Amino acid sequence: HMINAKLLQLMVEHSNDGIVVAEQEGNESILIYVNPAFERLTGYCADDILYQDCRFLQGEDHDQPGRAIIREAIREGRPCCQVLRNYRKDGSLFWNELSITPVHNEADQLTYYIGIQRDVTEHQQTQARLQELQSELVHVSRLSAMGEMASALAHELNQPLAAISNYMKGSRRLLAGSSDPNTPKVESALDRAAEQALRAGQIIRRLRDFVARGESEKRVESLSKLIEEAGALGLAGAREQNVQLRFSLDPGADLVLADRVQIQQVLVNLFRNALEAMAQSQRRELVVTNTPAADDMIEVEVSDTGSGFQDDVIPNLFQTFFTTKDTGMGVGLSISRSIIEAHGGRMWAESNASGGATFRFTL
Amino acid sequence: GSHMINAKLLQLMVEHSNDGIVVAEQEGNESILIYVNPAFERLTGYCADDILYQDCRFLQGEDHDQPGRAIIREAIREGRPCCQVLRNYRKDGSLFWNELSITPVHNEADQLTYYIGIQRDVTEHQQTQARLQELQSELVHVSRLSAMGEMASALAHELNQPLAAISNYMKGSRRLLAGSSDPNTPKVESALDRAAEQALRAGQIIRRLRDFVARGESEKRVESLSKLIEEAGALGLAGAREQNVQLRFSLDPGADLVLADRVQIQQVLVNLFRNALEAMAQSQRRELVVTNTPAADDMIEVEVSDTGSGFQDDVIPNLFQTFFTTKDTGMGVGLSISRSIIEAHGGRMWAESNASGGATFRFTL
Numbered sequence: 001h002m003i004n005a006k007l008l009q010l011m012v013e014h015s016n017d018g019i020v021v022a023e024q025e026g027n028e029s030i031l032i033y034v035n036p037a038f039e040r041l042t043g044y045c046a047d048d049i050l051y052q053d054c055r056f057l058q059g060e061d062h063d064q065p066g067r068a069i070i071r072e073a074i075r076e077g078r079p080c081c082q083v084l085r086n087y088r089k090d091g092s093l094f095w096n097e098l099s100i101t102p103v104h105n106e107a108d109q110l111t112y113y114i115g116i117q118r119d120v121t122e123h124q125q126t127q128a129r130l131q132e133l134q135s136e137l138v139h140v141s142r143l144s145a146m147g148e149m150a151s152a153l154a155h156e157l158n159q160p161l162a163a164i165s166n167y168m169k170g171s172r173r174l175l176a177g178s179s180d181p182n183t184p185k186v187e188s189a190l191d192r193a194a195e196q197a198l199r200a201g202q203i204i205r206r207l208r209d210f211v212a213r214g215e216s217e218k219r220v221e222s223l224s225k226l227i228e229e230a231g232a233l234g235l236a237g238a239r240e241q242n243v244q245l246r247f248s249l250d251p252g253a254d255l256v257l258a259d260r261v262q263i264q265q266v267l268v269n270l271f272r273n274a275l276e277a278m279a280q281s282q283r284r285e286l287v288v289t290n291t292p293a294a295d296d297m298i299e300v301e302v303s304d305t306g307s308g309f310q311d312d313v314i315p316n317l318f319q320t321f322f323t324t325k326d327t328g329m330g331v332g333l334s335i336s337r338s339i340i341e342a343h344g345g346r347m348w349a350e351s352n353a354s355g356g357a358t359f360r361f362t363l
Numbered sequence: 364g365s366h367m368i369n370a371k372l373l374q375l376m377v378e379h380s381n382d383g384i385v386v387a388e389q390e391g392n393e394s395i396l397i398y399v400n401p402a403f404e405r406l407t408g409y410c411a412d413d414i415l416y417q418d419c420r421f422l423q424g425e426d427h428d429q430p431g432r433a434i435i436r437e438a439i440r441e442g443r444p445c446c447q448v449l450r451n452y453r454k455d456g457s458l459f460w461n462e463l464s465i466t467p468v469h470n471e472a473d474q475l476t477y478y479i480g481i482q483r484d485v486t487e488h489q490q491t492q493a494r495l496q497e498l499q500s501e502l503v504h505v506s507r508l509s510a511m512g513e514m515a516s517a518l519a520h521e522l523n524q525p526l527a528a529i530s531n532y533m534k535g536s537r538r539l540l541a542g543s544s545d546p547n548t549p550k551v552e553s554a555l556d557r558a559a560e561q562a563l564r565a566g567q568i569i570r571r572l573r574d575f576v577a578r579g580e581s582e583k584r585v586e587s588l589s590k591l592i593e594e595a596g597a598l599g600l601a602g603a604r605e606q607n608v609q610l611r612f613s614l615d616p617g618a619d620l621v622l623a624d625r626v627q628i629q630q631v632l633v634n635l636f637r638n639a640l641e642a643m644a645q646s647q648r649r650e651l652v653v654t655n656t657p658a659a660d661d662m663i664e665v666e667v668s669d670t671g672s673g674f675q676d677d678v679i680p681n682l683f684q685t686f687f688t689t690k691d692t693g694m695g696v697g698l699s700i701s702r703s704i705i706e707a708h709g710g711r712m713w714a715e716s717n718a719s720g721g722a723t724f725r726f727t728l
């Protein structure tokens with residue numbers, strides 16, 4: 001061999017990843033060796049748990065498919081890597097990434113197993129949390145798309161329906177002083193037309209209020225937390241695009257009264273727009289900063305080095321459906337501005353000195 | 364001074380482990396390999412006799428600049444363990460994903476720093492993670508787009524009848540006023556003409572929005588049902604594992620290729636999977652079956668059955684109408700968009716109750 005066996009055992013004993021060695025006895029794989037790393041990870045003392053099967057790490061959490069795959073791989077005589085939910089001495093849960101390798105010891109005419117085990121609890125937590133944030137943000141983004149669609153369509157349609165109603169009113173005023181035998185039939189037809197216009201407006205508001213229904217809650221929220229959550233969702237691709245991230249956060253100006261999912265979605269949209277504007281940019285730098293502002297408010301600034309704003313673009317940004325992308329919708333900024341203004345702040349934009357875009361809002 | 368296993372036995376276990384295990388010796392800024400196991404020779408495609416007593420940075424190669432390198436060196440310098448993931452290349456140049464844990468230990472007797480590295484091939488998991496990360500962004504964009512599109516379509520359909528009634532009323536009123544002698548008749552005719560043109564322009568604005576949002580490639584290509592079912596399951600059936608929901612994909616390779624737009628069928632299936640998982644939230648038996656079969660007109664039928672709360676008696680004929688929902692926070696657009704997409708693709712989408720009290724959806728393509 002290449003190493004003195006004492007050195008190998010020493011390395012195993014002081015390794016940080018849990019290492020155990022077990023002996024096949026019937027339908028039990030009794031532990032015969034554990035290292036102090038495993039004692040730490042499990043909170044169990046070797047003298048207590050030796051020469052038993054490690055199923056008690058599951059405890060009362062019997063039914064998970066990791067158990068089944070591991071058991072059948074053991075019978076089949078094949079290594080297997082899985083993840084399991086294990087409980088420590090004090091009952092606390094952790095996720096355990098486990099590799100079992102079965103080995104046939106010829107000299108003893110026996111089967112042994114070697115198990116390497118890592119604590120993937122923190123990673124599993126953050127991944128599940130991001131899954132939750134992703135699903136909730138998807139639902140809120142489709143909701144806001146529907147809402148701004150209805151609002152813009154209603155506003156654009158308001159003028160023709162009002163013109164029709166006024167025309168019917170004026171025509172009835174003109175025909176009031178008439179003797180033509182058809183005049184009553186005309187009056188009935190025009191009255192029914194006006195009622196149709198009224199019902200069209202009613203249908204507009206019916207759909208508008210059926211989709212835009214939702215709790216307009218406001219709670220104390222940490223800006224650091226929601227900025228990190230929004231970066232986690234929206235700024236995934238920053239590394240591959242070589243985007244420089246800077247979070248300049250102020251702990252004294254960190255708690256605001258807001259609906260966290262709505263500010264999350266405004267920031268996610270800003271981050272996506274900034275990353276897109278810096279796809280062909282030589283300098284790719286994103287700065288997020290919070291500062292105190294007047295009226296006991298807090299101002300958030302997001303600056304990039306992207307393609308920025310053409311001269312006429314800035315005053316159109318917040319209008320619904322204004323877009324510079326061939327496949328863009330132009331609803332993100334309009335919804336964002338309405339959300340910021342509904343929360344008691346004002347959202348607005350400006351060009352920065354680097355040729356990119358800076359967005360600010362207050363809460 | 365304890366011994367619970369003969370050290371020879373421990374070496375035997377390490378030698379036959381399936382996870383790569385190496386041991387390295389600190390000699391300056393190079394951590395020379397002094398031990399590798401056959402698992403590592405497999406994973407790396409290198410022979411120990413060739414690579415022994417060298418640093419393993421050559422696994423990165425020309426991929427010099429990665430954050431793993433910075434994290435690892437600072438952890439090595441600091442004398443502290445580290446777990447990372449890296450992109451390494453084998454002997455033949457092929458790439459692989461390597462989950463690597465290094466633990467530095469100071470052995471007093473030799474007065475030296477050694478390292479123990481446990482390493483796994485995490486190639487497939489990283490692949491699936493990147494693939495799901497792309498799909499989620501694509502699904503976000505397309506779901507937002509389809510929501511807006513069906514919103515416009517339904518709003519247009521609901522408004523169409525009143526505006527046509529208004530136009531017909533103006534036409535009939537002009538017919539009545541034709542051949543009249545009241546002096547106000549010309550002014551009334553002008554007003555009614557302008558009202559009719561306003562209704563026309565309202566229809567024009569409706570179609571403006573409908574064609575502005577519904578712009579998009581409606582392409583159709585040959586697609587494997589197994590593949591798109593797996594992508595949709597990866598997105599929609601994430602929580603099936605933890606809810607102990609039994610998933611069954613009964614796919615037939617002879618009836619596997621269809622002509623479809625993959626992103627639209629992806630979003631229909633994602634919605635079906637979410638609906639099926641939701642209907643089995645308060646169900647004790649949670650079983651989801653997907654099945655494909657040949658169908659007439661050179662088509663293929665896909666069935667998705669669950670053991671959920673299913674459909675009340677009057678629910679079935681309302682399912683596909685826009686805005687029909689049984690959820691307090693639901694939108695009721697998923698099934699309407701799905702059916703319009705399937706019919707635009709040449710198939711028929713429909714639903715029925717199954718014998719287990721749940722829901723069965725079928726479509727053809």
Ligand SMILES: Cc1cc2nc3c(=O)[nH]c(=O)nc-3n(C[C@H](O)[C@H](O)[C@H](O)COP(=O)(O)O)c2cc1C
Pocket residue numbers: 020021022027029053054055057058067070071084085086096098100113114115117
């Ligand atoms: C070497 C080795 C290490 C194991 N380590 C763990 C562990 O850390 N946590 C755990 O939950 N199960 C672990 N298992 C699996 C359990 O010991 C047990 O074999 C498995 O859950 C199947 O149990 P069953 O077939 O009796 O239901 C390990 C198995 C082996 C062979």
Ligand SMILES: Cc1cc2nc3c(=O)[nH]c(=O)nc-3n(C[C@H](O)[C@H](O)[C@H](O)COP(=O)(O)O)c2cc1C
Pocket residue numbers: 385386387392394418419420422423432433435436439449451461463465478479480482
């Ligand atoms: C035990 C051990 C195993 C290692 N295995 C690998 C490996 O498989 N692949 C790899 O790219 N780097 C591996 N490294 C890290 C490299 O040896 C090196 O420390 C790292 O690339 C930093 O290189 P630098 O010192 O030039 O910055 C390992 C380090 C140790 C201590």
Ligand SMILES: Nc1ncnc2c1ncn2[C@@H]1O[C@H](COP(=O)(O)OP(=O)(O)OP(=O)(O)O)[C@@H](O)[C@H]1O
Pocket residue numbers: 269273274277304306308313317322323324325327328329330331332333334349357359
């Ligand atoms: N960094 C930026 N900040 C703000 N507005 C920007 C920025 N870069 C470009 N814009 C302009 O703002 C417009 C609207 O952006 P908004 O986020 O509202 O929607 P979008 O990104 O175009 O599309 P979608 O709503 O589908 O995300 C863009 O089309 C572009 O003209």
Ligand SMILES: Nc1ncnc2c1ncn2[C@@H]1O[C@H](COP(=O)(O)OP(=O)(O)OP(=O)(O)O)[C@@H](O)[C@H]1O
Pocket residue numbers: 634635637638639640641642671678682687688689690692693694695696697698699722
């Ligand atoms: N698993 C299910 N299978 C079939 N029909 C279901 C299921 N769950 C609920 N339904 C009924 O069918 C309707 C289909 O709704 P659809 O999937 O179109 O949207 P939603 O889930 O209500 O909301 P959203 O569109 O926002 O996702 C539900 O509103 C309900 O009436």
